[PDB]
Design a protein around this ligand. Structure first.
Ligand SMILES: O=P(O)(O)O[C@H]1[C@H](OP(=O)(O)O)[C@@H](OP(=O)(O)O)[C@H](OP(=O)(O)O)[C@@H](OP(=O)(O)O)[C@H]1OP(=O)(O)O
Ligand SMILES: [Zn+2]
Lengths: 182, 48, 562, 48, 172, 223, 48
RNA sequence: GUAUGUCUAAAGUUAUGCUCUUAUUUACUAACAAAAUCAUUGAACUAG
């Protein structure tokens, strides 16, 4: 943790060290009081700003490592792309338990750091796919509504949904070119 | 001492003149036959 | 059977009794009904942990008879020196070994040696003109010298202004030494510690033997062939000296060794540890603990510090991969407060302190004592505290050992249960402690600026109410403190900038929260209690303590008066 | 070890008849023999 | 010529000011100037204690000067190690500010004890020996207050100076 | 209390424990540190065919064949038993023979002028332990346990309970007097003690510190 | 040389043939450095 | 508290109904914790 205003030690104001393997993803809470972290150690941890103590630890026998993290527009839940080709969801309120029903399945992502995004209104969730496609699911029922094929025949690791447009999404990956879907 | 390394014979012992051994003073007449050789390392070794 | 064994005298000669310093054999009341193993037998323990509890009483028994169990007159037995001590075990006896290790733990043997050496140095430092000493030098001996039992070195060397007419080597109490003849300009002192046994405990022959052996030995060690060999037998509380004497030195060493043996605190620590190892106790308290009856002494002009270890070792619990829950250490702090000025020396105990260590509950007490010692050494003599108030019994022994380097600092226990543990409820202190990235000392005035308007005892009482309230119910106490959003807590402050008129209302709300929750929890009618009982509730006075009895009489005598 | 203790007993009481207690008996030949015979049997054991 | 060089040095000493700057603290190139500036500010404090000797602990002044002598000598010679100079300079800097006495005392605690995990260390505190205990024994890894008795003497004299500056600034 | 089997005295004997008081070890004053017992290297004092002297046979003779004695484990093991200075005299003669056989640098001067002048152990050498001042006396002021150094200036012994009480100084007196003030105020306001009044909590000093301090500060101007 | 070939550098053999650890050993180091009677008997003979 | 196991991540470059908010119940785990009746004493101590 750095604070560019501080010149001491180049601004390194805090170090979090409870993870045991390479960090995979980082994501702040919308209010910036806490942040989420994922690691190759197969655990997810929640931290208070500048305090080297994880307030929550998310780990399970069947839980795979989560290469990507994002927060739902409502600020009530966060989602994690998992190596088991699934997307899980977790509450953003104390104890942060895993949501037993909001699980999105269908795409392929094992072996790739594939990002996931939410529609501007939070009505939908979407993600890339290792076989050059863009999946999209309904946020309420988690039902897969579409899987658009993206040119280039390469993994589409980058996906983002426009914060104001009703349906414009951008994606890219190993093909190099950036594509817009609508 | 446990920390003291064994002394070098040629540097610390070989040059010091040895002290007297335990030799009971023999009588010139009562020990005439033994006096000249009793305390040798191998008494009479050279006497054929 | 007592008569057949030769009476109490003969029986006790086989025991460690003389080393305990206990006054009389009559007071030898063994606490046959309490001990650690008695507290442990009910707990959730594994079969291994239960079988291991029997070692404790066996250790006590072995320690009591240790002078006989480790006697020198044995049929066979290679001498094995016990680590960090000058004790030799004539055989491998694990139960004895471990009990002796428990007594000499925290490097006590080396501390005793240095303490006595410093005492002799400090005495000689005042006799420069009387004894015609040009200078006194405390030698930079090898770190293990105090338990190097086959050779030695001078601990102290003194240079004369002119020269001294020294007698032949003689015992400390030998009368009429001839000072004529031998003359020397440099004299040395060597303090030898030993641990006698039932066969070998004649300290006089020991000191003579050490003096003659080390002076005649071919080793280059002493700066001159003239000096004094001082010997102390730790197992038998015996002392003697042998060496050259000059006019006036012998009487001085006789008087000083008698005083050092009686008053030196390191030897006292050794005696108390032996008694603890035996579970024998004597009521030897000369000054009363800090109590609700004498707490006004806190505000005396003498410098004093409260020390609280409660937050030194702190842990968070998390689920392990195996399915258990593991404790992980987090940042802690040592609460050191001067109640007169309000200066709080908050030592942040960063997690890196515990890296790779186990048995942290124990190590944290030693860490607290070590940081207190570092703080004291960081203060100039005129600023060092005259007394340190130990809020928890667990800290007494570690601090007593670490304070052997500061023999003028009185250690004072307390009968109070002061709420300093609730200091981590103060948002600013919690923040500073939890965000620290390295070991650090942070200073705060726990009274902020109240001292410009109220007395120190008033500030301490206000602080006590705020802390005891936070300890009683943190959320409702915080609700009281933050009841008005206009009263901003300034920077460089811990509490809101209330005026004293507002402080009276805050104190009333805190007081009521504390007393109503106490009355509810214990079903005590606060209205029936006496003024002193209410005081004892806010201060947390131990109701079982004798001071409550004596204070009751100190007021019922007035109830007789008029 | 017992043999040497026994030898010391018989040796000292012969040696000290009109001398009393204290160091000075240097008749090491019998105990020395005891240890040489110990080595005779210890040799094959330690070699193996 | 000893008196000539001495008077020239006592004169040259006045060509620089004692005011410390937070950016100068820790400058490798400016280290000699900061070291001299620190020595000079210490002398300034001592001159004010000399000016108030009969009102504030006269018996301690002599011992304080005798203890500060090795520090001042090393500062003149720029021999004081970088870490020690940075700490000392931080103390004197806070001491020069209008009302930062507590910050000066915190910086002094950083100078004396510092950030070492075990300022003094502990040896065999229990009956269960472990290899890890060798680390916490301290020794060479101890705090600055443990380097040697001369260092403790001058460091605590600096503390005594902070206490004097507090007394002086409050009465005057 | 002492058990019956200790208190009871064997018939052959006849203090209540006199049979066990015979008491080197002193079971009655075991707290006193003991000086060494001193060194006493004491010594005591048919015709033989070989030497003529009577009392031994030929084989036991100390004369070559022809034609004082020593008086505790430590005593027996002392390798210096019977020593009379020989080894130390030799050492001293050797040392006596070898004895007979054989500025400031401007920086220091400028600093001394400006000052008007002319690992390691934790203990401070100049910080003399208080008990070291009492070596020339029999009484002990220093408590080795608490490290308290008793003085008439610091406090006084109560004698009734043998405890030592620190005198009150400065703000300590102020608090003790404020304590008295609140206590009187309790009797004054009528809350008193025997009466189970709810208002009592309002008149406890520690429970109402700022109130009573300001209240005394007020009344002090009226006295 | 035997001690060092086994990697037991944490065991120091004194010049009087005492064998002591130079630090507190881990349980694995203790198990690995558990020398047998042949070594210890040889060492005691060298000590004598 | 152990045995014991695992980790240590640049470079020293090999050529191309079903949920949620939240107040509880129950179980398991915690060498975390000096807990106020029954002249001040469980107290640093227990492991296959
Ligand atoms: O214990 P004691 O009955 O008094 O006998 C001792 C003892 O010999 P033992 O115990 O083996 O019989 C000594 O041996 P250590 O205790 O030292 O092992 C020995 O002295 P040494 O060391 O020279 O062997 C000494 O002999 P001395 O007559 O010279 O005193 C001898 O005494 P006694 O056998 O004459 O009683
Ligand atoms: Zn004869």
């Amino acid at each position: 943790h750095y604070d560019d205003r501080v010149s001491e030690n180049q601004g390194l104001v805090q170090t979090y060290d409870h993870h045991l393997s390479s960090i995979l993803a980082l994501k702040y809470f919308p209010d910036g009081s806490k942040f989420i972290s994922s690691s190759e150690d197969k655990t997810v941890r929640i931290w208070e700003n500048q305090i080297n103590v994880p307030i929550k630890q998310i780990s399970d026998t069947a839980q795979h490592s989560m290469p990507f993290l994002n927060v739902h527009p409502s600020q009530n839940y966060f989602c994690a792309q998992s190596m088991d080709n699934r997307i899980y969801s977790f509450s953003l309120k104390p104890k942060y338990k895993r949501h037993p029903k909001k699980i999105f399945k269908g795409h392929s992502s094992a072996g790739y750091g594939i990002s996931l995004a939410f529609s501007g209104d939070g009505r939908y969730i979407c993600s890339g796919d290792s076989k050059s496609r863009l999946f999209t699911w309904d946020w309420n029922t988690s039902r897969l509504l579409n899987n658009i094929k993206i040119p280039g025949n390469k993994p589409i690791t980058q996906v983002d949904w426009h914060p104001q447009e009703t349906s414009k999404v951008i994606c890219s990956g190993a093909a190099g070119k950036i594509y817009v879907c609508d | 001492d446990d920390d003291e390394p064994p002394l070098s014979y040629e540097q610390h012992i070989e040059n010091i003149e040895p002290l007297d051994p335990i030799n009971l003073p023999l009588d010139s007449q009562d020990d005439e036959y033994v006096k000249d050789w009793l305390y040798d390392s191998r008494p009479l070794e050279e006497d054929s | 059977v007592i008569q057949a064994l030769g009476g109490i005298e003969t029986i006790l000669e086989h025991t460690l009794f003389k080393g305990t310093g206990f006054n009389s054999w009559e007071g030898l009341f063994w606490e046959k009904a309490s001990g650690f193993e008695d507290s442990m037998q009910f707990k959730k323990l594994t079969h291994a942990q239960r079988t291991g509890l029997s070692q404790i009483p066996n250790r006590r028994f072995t320690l009591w008879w240790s002078p006989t169990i480790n006697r020198a007159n044995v049929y066979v037995g290679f001498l094995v020196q016990l680590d960090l001590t000058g004790i030799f075990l004539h055989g491998k006896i694990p139960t004895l070994k471990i009990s002796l290790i428990q007594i000499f733990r925290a490097h006590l043997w080396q501390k005793i040696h240095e303490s006595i050496v410093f005492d002799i140095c400090q005495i000689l430092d005042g006799e420069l003109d009387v004894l015609q000493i040009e200078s006194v030098t405390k030698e930079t001996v090898h770190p293990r010298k105090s338990y190097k039992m086959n050779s030695s070195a001078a601990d102290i060397t003194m240079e004369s202004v002119h020269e001294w007419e020294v007698s032949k080597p003689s015992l400390l109490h030998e009368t009429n030494d001839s000072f004529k003849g031998l003359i020397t300009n440099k004299m040395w002192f060597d303090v030898q510690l030993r641990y006698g046994d039932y066969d070998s405990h004649d300290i006089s022959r020991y000191v003579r033997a050490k003096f003659l052996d080390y002076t005649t030995d071919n080793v280059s060690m002493y700066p001159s062939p003239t000096g004094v060999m001082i010997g102390i037998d730790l197992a038998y509380n015996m002392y003697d000296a042998y060496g050259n004497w000059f006019n006036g030195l012998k009487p001085l060493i006789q008087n000083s060794m008698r005083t050092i043996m009686k008053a030196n605190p390191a030897l006292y620590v050794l005696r108390e540890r032996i008694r603890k190892g035996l579970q024998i106790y004597q009521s030897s308290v000369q000054e009363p603990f800090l109590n609700s009856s004498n707490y006004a002494e806190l505000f005396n002009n003498d410098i004093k510090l409260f020390v609280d270890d409660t937050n030194v070792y702190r842990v968070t619990v998390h689920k392990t991969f195996e399915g258990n829950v593991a404790t992980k250490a987090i940042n802690g702090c040592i609460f050191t407060l001067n109640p007169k000025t309000g200066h709080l020396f908050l030592k942040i105990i960063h997690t890196s302190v515990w890296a790779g260590q186990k048995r942290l509950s124990q190590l944290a007490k030693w860490k607290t004592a070590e940081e207190v010692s570092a703080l004291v050494r960081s203060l100039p003599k005129e600023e060092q505290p005259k007394q340190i108030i130990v809020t928890r019994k667990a800290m007494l022994d570690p601090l007593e050992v670490h304070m052997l380097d500061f023999p003028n600092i009185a250690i004072r226990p307390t009968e109070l249960r002061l709420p300093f543990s609730a200091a981590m409820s103060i948002d600013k202190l919690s923040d500073v402690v939890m965000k620290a990235t390295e070991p650090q000392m942070v200073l705060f005035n726990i009274y902020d600026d109240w001292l410009d308007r109220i007395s120190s005892y008033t500030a301490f009482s206000r602080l006590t109410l705020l802390l005891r309230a936070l300890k009683t119910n943190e959320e409702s106490a915080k609700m009281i403190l933050l009841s008005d959003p206009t009263i901003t807590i300034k920077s460089y402050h811990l509490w809101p900038s209330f005026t004293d008129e507002q402080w009276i209302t805050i104190e009333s709300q805190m007081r009521d929260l504390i007393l109503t929750e106490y009355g509810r929890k214990y079903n005590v009618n606060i209205s029936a209690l006496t003024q002193t009982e209410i005081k004892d509730i806010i201060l947390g006075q131990n109701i079982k303590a004798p001071s409550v009895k004596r204070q009751k009489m100190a007021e019922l005598e007035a109830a007789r008066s008029e | 070890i017992r043999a040497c203790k026994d030898l010391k007993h018989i040796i000292y009481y012969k040696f000290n008849k009109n001398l009393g207690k204290g160091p000075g008996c240097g008749f090491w030949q019998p105990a020395w023999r005891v240890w040489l015979n110990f080595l005779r049997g210890t040799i094959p054991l330690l070699e193996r | 010529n000893r008196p000539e060089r001495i008077q020239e040095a006592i004169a040259q000493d006045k060509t620089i000011s004692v005011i410390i700057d937070p950016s100068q603290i820790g400058s490798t190139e400016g280290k000699p100037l900061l070291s001299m500036k620190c020595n000079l500010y210490i002398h300034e404090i001592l001159s004010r204690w000399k000016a108030s000797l009969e009102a504030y602990h006269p018996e301690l002044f002599l011992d304080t000067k005798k203890a500060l002598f090795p520090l001042l000598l090393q500062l003149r010679r720029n021999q004081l190690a970088p870490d020690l100079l940075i700490s000392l300079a931080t103390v004197l800097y806070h001491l020069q500010q209008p009302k930062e006495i507590n910050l000066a005392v915190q910086s002094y605690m950083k100078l004396s004890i510092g950030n070492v995990a075990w300022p003094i260390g502990v040896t065999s505190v229990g009956i269960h020996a472990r290899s890890a205990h060798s680390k916490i024994q301290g020794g060479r890894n101890a705090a600055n207050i443990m380097i040697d008795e001369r260092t403790r003497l001058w460091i605590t004299s600096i503390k005594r100076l902070i206490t004097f500056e507090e007394w002086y600034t409050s009465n005057h | 209390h002492i058990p019956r089997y200790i208190r009871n005295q064997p018939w052959y004997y006849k203090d209540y424990l006199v049979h066990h008081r015979q008491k080197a070890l002193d079971i009655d004053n075991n707290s006193e540190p003991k000086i060494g017992m001193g060194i006493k290297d004491e010594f005591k004092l048919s015709f033989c065919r070989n030497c003529g002297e009577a009392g031994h046979k030929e084989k036991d003779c100390m004369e070559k064949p022809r034609k004082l004695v020593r008086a505790d484990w430590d005593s027996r093991k002392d390798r210096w038993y019977g020593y009379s200075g020989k080894e130390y005299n030799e050492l001293i003669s050797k040392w006596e023979r070898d004895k007979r056989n054989k500025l400031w640098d401007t920086d220091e001067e400028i600093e001394l002028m400006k000052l008007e002048l002319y690992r390691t152990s934790t203990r401070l050498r100049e910080d003399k332990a208080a008990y070291l001042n009492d070596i020339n006396s029999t009484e002990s002021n220093y408590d080795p346990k608490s490290r308290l150094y008793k003085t008439e200036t610091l406090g006084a012994v109560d004698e009734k309970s043998k405890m030592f009480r620190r005198h009150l100084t400065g703000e300590g007196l102020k608090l003790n007097e404020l304590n008295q003030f609140a206590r009187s105020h309790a009797k004054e306001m009528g809350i008193r003690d025997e009466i189970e009044d709810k208002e009592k909590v309002q008149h406890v000093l520690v429970a109402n510190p700022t109130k009573y301090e300001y209240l005394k500060k007020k009344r002090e101007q009226e006295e | 040389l035997l001690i060092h070939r086994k990697g037991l550098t944490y065991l120091h053999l004194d010049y009087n043939f005492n064998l002591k650890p130079t630090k507190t050993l881990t349980t694995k180091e203790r198990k690995k450095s558990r020398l047998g009677n042949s070594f210890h008997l040889m060492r005691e003979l060298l000590k004598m």
